[PDB]
mmCIF file of C-alpha atoms and ligand atoms in Angstrom:
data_model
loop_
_atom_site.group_PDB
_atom_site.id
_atom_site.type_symbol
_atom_site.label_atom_id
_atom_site.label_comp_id
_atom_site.label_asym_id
_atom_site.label_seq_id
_atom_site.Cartn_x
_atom_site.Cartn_y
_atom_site.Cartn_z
ATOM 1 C CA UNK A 1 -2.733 -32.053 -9.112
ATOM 2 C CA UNK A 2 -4.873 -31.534 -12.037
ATOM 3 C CA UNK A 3 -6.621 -33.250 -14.652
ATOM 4 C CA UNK A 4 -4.327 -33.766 -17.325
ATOM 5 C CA UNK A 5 -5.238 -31.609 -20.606
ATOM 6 C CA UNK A 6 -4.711 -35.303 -22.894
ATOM 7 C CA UNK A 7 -4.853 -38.563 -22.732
ATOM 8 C CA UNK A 8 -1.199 -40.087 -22.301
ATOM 9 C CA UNK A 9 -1.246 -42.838 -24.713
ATOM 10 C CA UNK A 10 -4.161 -41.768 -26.980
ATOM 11 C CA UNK A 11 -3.925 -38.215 -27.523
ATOM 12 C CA UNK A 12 -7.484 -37.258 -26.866
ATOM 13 C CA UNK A 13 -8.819 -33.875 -25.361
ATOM 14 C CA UNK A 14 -9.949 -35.051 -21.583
ATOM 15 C CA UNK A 15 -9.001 -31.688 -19.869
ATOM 16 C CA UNK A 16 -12.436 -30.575 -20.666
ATOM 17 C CA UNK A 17 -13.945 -32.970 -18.744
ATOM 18 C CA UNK A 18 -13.179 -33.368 -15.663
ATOM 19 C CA UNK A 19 -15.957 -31.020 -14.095
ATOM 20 C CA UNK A 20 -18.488 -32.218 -17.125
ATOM 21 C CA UNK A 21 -17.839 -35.731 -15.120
ATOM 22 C CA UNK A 22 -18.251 -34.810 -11.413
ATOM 23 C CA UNK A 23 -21.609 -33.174 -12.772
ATOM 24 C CA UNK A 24 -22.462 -36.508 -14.124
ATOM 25 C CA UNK A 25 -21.644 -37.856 -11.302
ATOM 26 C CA UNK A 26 -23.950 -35.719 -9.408
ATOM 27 C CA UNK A 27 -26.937 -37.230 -11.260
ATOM 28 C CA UNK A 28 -27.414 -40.765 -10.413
ATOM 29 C CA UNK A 29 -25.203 -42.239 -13.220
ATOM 30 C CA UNK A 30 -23.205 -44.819 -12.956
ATOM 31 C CA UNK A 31 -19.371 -44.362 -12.889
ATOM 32 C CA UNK A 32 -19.395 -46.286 -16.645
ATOM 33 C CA UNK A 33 -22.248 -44.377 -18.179
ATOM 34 C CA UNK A 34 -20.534 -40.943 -17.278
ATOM 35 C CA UNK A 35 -18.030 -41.851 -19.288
ATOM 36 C CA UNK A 36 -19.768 -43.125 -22.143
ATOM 37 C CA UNK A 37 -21.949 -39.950 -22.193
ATOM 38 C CA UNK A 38 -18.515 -38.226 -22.629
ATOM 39 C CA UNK A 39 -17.909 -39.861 -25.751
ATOM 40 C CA UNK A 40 -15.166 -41.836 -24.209
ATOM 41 C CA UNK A 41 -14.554 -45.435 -26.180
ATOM 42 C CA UNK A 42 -11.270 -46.519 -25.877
ATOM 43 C CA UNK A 43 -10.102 -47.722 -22.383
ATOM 44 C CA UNK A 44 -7.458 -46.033 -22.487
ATOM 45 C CA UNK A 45 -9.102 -42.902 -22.064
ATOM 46 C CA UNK A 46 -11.093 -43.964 -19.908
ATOM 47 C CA UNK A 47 -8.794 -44.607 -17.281
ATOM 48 C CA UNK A 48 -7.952 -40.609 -17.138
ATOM 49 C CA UNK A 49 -11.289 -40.019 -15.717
ATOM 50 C CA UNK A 50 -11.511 -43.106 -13.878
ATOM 51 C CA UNK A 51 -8.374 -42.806 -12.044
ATOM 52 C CA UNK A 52 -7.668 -39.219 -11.652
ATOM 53 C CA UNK A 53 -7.607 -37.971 -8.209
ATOM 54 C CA UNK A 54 -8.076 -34.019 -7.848
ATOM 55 C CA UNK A 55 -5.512 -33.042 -5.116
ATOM 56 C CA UNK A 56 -5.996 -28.731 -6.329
ATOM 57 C CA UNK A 57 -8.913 -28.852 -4.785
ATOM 58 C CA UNK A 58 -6.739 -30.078 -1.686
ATOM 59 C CA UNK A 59 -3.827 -27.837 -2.260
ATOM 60 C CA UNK A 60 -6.267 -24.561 -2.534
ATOM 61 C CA UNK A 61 -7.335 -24.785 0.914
ATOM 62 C CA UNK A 62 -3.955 -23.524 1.574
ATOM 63 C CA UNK A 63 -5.044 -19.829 0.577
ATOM 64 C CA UNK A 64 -2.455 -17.114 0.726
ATOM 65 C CA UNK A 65 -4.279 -14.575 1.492
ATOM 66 C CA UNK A 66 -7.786 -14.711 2.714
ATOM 67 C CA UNK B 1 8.986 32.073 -3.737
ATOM 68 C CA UNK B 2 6.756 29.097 -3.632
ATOM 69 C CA UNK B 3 8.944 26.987 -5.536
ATOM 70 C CA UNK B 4 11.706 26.458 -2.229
ATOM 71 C CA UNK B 5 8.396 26.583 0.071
ATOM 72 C CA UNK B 6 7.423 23.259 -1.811
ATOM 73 C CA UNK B 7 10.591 21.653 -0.629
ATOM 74 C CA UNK B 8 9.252 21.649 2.858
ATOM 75 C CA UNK B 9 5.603 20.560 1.811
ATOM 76 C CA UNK B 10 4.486 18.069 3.176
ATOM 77 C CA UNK B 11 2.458 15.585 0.555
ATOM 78 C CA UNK B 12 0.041 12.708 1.157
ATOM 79 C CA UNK B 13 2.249 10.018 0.364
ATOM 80 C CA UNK B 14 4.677 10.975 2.797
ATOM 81 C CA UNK B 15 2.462 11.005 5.989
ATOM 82 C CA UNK B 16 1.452 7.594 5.643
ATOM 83 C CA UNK B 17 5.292 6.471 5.805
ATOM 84 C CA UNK B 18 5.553 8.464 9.209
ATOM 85 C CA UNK B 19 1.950 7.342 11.148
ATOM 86 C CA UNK B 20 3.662 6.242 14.159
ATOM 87 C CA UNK B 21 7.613 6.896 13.772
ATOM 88 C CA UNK B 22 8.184 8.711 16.895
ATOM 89 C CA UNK B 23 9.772 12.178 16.799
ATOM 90 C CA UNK B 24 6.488 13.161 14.903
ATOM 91 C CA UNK B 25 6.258 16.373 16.775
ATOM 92 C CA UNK B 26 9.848 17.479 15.981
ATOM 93 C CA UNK B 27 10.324 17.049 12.420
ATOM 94 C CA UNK B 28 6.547 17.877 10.638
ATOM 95 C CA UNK B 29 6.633 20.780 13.592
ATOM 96 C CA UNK B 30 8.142 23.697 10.974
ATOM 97 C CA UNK B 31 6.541 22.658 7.782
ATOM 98 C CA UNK B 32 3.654 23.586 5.737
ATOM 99 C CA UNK B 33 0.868 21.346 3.694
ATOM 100 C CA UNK B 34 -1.609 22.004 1.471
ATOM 101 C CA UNK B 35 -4.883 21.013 3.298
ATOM 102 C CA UNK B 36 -8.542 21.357 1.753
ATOM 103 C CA UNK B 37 -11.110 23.912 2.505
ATOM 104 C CA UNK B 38 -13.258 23.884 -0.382
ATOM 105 C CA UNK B 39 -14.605 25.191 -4.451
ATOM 106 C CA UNK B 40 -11.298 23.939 -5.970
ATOM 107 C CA UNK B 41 -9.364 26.990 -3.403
ATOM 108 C CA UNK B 42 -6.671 26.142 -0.824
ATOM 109 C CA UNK B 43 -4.853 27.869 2.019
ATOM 110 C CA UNK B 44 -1.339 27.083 3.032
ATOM 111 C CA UNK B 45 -1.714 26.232 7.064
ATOM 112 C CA UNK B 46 0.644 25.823 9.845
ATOM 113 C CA UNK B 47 1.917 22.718 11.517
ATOM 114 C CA UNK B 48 1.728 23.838 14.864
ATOM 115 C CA UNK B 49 0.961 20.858 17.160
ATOM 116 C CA UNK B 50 -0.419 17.135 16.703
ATOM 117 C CA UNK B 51 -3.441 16.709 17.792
ATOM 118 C CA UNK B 52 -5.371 13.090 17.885
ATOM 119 C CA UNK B 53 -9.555 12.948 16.622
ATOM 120 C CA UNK B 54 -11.606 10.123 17.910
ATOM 121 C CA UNK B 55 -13.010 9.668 14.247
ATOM 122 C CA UNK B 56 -11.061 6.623 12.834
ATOM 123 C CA UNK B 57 -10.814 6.770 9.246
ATOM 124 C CA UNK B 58 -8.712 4.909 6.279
ATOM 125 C CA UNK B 59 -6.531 6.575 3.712
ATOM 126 C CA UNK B 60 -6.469 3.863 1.045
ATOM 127 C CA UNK B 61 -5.064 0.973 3.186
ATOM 128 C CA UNK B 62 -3.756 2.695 6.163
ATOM 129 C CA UNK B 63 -5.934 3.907 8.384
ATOM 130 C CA UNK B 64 -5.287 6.754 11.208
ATOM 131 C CA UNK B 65 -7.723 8.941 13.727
ATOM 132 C CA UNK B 66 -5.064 11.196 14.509
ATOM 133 C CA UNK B 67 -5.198 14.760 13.706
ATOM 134 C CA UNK B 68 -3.095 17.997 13.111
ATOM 135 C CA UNK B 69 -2.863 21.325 14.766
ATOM 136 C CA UNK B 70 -3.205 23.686 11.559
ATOM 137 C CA UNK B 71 -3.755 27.733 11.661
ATOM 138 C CA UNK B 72 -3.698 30.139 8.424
ATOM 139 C CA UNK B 73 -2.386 32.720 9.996
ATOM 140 C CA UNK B 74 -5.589 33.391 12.489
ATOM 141 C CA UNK B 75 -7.637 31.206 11.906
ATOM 142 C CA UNK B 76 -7.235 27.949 13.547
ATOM 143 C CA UNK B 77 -9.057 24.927 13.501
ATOM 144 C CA UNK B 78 -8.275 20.605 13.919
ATOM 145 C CA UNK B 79 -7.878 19.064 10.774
ATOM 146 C CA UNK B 80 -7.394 15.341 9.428
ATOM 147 C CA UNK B 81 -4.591 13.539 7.478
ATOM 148 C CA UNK B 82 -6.885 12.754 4.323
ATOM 149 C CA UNK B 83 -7.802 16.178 3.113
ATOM 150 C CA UNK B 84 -4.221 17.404 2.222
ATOM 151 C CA UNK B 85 -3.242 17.854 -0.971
ATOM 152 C CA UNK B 86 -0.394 16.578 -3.309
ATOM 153 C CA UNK B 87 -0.291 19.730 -5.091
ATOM 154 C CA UNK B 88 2.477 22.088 -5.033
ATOM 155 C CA UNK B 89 1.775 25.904 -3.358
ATOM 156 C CA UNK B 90 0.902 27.751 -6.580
ATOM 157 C CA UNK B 91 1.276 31.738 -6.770
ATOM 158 C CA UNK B 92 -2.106 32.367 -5.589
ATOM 159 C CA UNK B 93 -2.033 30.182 -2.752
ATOM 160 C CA UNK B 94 1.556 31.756 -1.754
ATOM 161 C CA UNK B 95 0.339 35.114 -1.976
ATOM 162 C CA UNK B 96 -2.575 34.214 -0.391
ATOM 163 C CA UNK B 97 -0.694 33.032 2.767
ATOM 164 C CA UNK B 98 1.843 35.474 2.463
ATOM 165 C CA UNK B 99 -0.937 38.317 2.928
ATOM 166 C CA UNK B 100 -2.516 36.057 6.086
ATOM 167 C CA UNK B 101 0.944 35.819 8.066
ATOM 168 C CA UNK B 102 1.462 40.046 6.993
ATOM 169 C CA UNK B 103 -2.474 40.628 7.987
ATOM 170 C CA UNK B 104 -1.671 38.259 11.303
ATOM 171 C CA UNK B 105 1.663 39.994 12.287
ATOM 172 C CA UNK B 106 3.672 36.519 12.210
ATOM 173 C CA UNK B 107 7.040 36.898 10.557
ATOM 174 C CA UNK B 108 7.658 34.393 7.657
ATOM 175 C CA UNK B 109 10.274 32.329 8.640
ATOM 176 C CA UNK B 110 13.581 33.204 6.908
ATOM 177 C CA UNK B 111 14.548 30.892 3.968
ATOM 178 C CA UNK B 112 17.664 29.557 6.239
ATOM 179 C CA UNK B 113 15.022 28.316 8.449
ATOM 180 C CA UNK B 114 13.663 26.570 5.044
ATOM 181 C CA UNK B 115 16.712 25.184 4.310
ATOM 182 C CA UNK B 116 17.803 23.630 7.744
ATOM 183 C CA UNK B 117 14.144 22.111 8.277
ATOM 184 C CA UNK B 118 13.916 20.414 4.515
ATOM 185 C CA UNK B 119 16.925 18.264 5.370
ATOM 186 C CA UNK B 120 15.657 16.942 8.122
ATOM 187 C CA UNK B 121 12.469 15.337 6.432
ATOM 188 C CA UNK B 122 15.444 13.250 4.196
ATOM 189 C CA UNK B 123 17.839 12.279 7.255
ATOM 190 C CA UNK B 124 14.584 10.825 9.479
ATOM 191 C CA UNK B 125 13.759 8.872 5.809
ATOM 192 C CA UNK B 126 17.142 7.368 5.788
ATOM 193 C CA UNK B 127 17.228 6.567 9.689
ATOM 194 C CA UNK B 128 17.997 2.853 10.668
ATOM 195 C CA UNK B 129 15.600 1.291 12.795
ATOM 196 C CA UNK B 130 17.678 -0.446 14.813
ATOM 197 C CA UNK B 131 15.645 0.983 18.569
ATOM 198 C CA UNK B 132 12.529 -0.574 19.655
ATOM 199 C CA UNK B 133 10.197 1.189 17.123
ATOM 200 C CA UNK B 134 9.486 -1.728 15.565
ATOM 201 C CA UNK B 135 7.664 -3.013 18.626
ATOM 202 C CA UNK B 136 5.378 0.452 19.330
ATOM 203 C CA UNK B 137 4.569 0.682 15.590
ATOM 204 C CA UNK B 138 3.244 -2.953 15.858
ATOM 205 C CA UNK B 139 1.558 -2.107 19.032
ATOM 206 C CA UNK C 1 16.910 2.699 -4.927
ATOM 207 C CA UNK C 2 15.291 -0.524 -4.275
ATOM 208 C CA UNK C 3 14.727 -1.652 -0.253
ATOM 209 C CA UNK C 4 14.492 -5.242 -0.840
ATOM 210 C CA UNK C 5 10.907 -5.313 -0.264
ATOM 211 C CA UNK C 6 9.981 -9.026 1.123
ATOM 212 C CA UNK C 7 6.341 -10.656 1.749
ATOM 213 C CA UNK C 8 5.470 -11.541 4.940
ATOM 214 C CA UNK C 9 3.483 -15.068 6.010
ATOM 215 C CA UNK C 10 0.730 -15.748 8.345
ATOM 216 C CA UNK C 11 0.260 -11.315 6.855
ATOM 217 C CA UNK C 12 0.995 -11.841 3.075
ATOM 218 C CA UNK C 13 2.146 -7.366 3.680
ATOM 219 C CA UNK C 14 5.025 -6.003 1.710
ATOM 220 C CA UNK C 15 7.991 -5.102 4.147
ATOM 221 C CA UNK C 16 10.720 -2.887 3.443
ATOM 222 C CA UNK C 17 13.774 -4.784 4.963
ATOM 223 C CA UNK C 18 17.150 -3.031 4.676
ATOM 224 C CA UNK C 19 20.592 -5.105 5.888
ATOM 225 C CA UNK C 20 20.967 -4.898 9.764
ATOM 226 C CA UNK C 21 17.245 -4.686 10.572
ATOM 227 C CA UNK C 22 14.930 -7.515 12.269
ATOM 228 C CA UNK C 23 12.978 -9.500 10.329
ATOM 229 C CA UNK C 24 9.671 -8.580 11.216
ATOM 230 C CA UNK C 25 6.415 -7.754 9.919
ATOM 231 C CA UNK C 26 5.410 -4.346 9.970
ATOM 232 C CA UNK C 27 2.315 -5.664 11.281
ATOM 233 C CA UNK C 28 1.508 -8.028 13.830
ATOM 234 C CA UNK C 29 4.142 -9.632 14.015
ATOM 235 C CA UNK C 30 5.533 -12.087 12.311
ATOM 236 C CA UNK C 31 9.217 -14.011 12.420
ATOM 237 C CA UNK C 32 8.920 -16.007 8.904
ATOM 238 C CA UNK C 33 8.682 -14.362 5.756
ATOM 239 C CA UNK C 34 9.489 -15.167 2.139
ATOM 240 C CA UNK C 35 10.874 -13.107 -0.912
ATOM 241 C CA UNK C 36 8.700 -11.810 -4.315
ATOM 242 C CA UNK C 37 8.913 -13.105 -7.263
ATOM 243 C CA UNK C 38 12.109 -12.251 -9.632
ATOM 244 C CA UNK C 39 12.464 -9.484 -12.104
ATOM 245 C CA UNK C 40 14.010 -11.022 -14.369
ATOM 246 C CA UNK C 41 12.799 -12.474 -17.678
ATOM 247 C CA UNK C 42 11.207 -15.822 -17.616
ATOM 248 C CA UNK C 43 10.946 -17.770 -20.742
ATOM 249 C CA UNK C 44 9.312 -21.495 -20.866
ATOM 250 C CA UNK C 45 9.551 -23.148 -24.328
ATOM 251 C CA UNK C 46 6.755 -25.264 -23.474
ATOM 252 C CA UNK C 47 7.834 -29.099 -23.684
ATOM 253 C CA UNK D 1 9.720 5.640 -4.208
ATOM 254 C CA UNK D 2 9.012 8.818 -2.659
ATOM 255 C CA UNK D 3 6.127 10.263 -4.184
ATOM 256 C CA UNK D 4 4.161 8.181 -6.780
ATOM 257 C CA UNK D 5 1.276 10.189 -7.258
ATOM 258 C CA UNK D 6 0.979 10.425 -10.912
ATOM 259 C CA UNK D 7 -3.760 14.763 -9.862
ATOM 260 C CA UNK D 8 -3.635 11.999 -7.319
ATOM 261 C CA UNK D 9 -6.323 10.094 -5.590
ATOM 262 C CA UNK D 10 -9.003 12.347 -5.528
ATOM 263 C CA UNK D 11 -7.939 14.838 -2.629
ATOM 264 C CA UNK D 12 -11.563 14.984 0.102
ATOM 265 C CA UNK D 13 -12.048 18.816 0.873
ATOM 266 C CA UNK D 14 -12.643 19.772 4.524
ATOM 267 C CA UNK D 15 -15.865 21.794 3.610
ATOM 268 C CA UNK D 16 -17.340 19.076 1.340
ATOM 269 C CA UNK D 17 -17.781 16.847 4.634
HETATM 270 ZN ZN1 LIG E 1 -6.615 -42.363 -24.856
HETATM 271 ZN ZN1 LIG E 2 6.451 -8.615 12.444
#
């Protein structure tokens, strides 16, 4: 649903990052150099950004109320 | 005493529970609420009739346009269900009513009257609504 | 003194459902409708 | 849940309107 709040096999903050990526995104970067920007090295962690898929933003079109 | 007159009063929170359960005219019909005049004085009025205002208005999140029927002894007037007060008849107010109904020539109904109209406020809170009330309240 | 208040759906309005009554909205109607959230005490030991 | 006024919600006067 969300991104995750660490990397699962290095242990690294990437929940803080997510957003700081789509805006990177928004400039003309390249998916690679987002990530680097983000001080993101090992592959590992790079895969959290690089893979995630943000289905809240999906599932909060289903509003309760209003 | 106004202490057993506040057993039939009528309070805001209580109205909104009761905007369109029928049988409206035959339970309210006997009571007496505390409605504004105002700087900080009130006057205990009758519940004579129910009237309905064309002037729409919300109280909180309900909203209702009807009105109510109220007199202090002579002096009569329509009136709305948002300037009624949750405050209990004090002395002042109770003597002030009792000397409009003695300057009016209406006789205060007798406590027994009191006492048989109170319960009925309680028996139409705990009444099933198993008729089609549901439907006309929706409506 | 509790009524079993419920929420209703496509109205999201607290209802006051006692036993033997329809459930309904007591606005617009509305067949489906779900139950608040518990009272009682809820604990995670986040792991 | 009869009366939860807790005063109240600022009573409007009939004159003041
Ligand atoms: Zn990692
Ligand atoms: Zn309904």
């Amino acid at each position: 649903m969300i991104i995750p709040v660490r990397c699962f096999t290095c242990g690294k903050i990437v929940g803080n990052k997510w957003e700081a990526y789509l805006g990177l995104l928004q400039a003309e970067y390249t998916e690679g150099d987002a990530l680097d920007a983000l001080g993101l090295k090992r592959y590992c962690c790079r895969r959290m950004l690089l893979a995630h898929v943000d289905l809240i933003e999906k599932l909060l079109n289903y509003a309760p109320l209003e | 005493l106004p202490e057993e007159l506040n057993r039939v009063r009528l309070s805001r929170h209580k109205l909104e529970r009761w905007c369109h359960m029928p049988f409206f005219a035959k339970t309210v019909t006997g009571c007496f609420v505390r409605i504004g005049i105002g700087k900080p004085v009130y006057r205990v009025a009758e519940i004579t009739g129910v009237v309905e205002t064309a002037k729409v208005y919300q109280l909180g999140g309900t909203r209702t346009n009807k009105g109510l029927q109220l007199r202090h002894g002579n002096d009569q007037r329509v009136f709305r269900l948002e300037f009624v007060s949750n405050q209990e008849f004090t002395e002042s107010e109770f003597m002030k009513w009792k000397e409009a109904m003695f300057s009016a020539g209406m006789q205060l109904p007798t406590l027994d009257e009191i006492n048989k109209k109170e319960l009925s406020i309680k028996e139409a809170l705990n009444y099933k609504f198993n008729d089609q009330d549901i439907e006309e309240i929706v409506k | 003194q509790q009524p079993m208040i419920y929420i209703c759906g496509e109205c999201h309005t607290e209802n006051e459902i006692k036993s033997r009554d329809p459930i309904r909205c007591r606005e617009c109607g509305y067949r489906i409708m779900y139950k608040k959230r518990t009272k009682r005490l809820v604990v995670f030991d986040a792991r | 849940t009869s009366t939860y006024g807790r005063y109240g919600s600022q009573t409007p006067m009939y004159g003041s309107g």
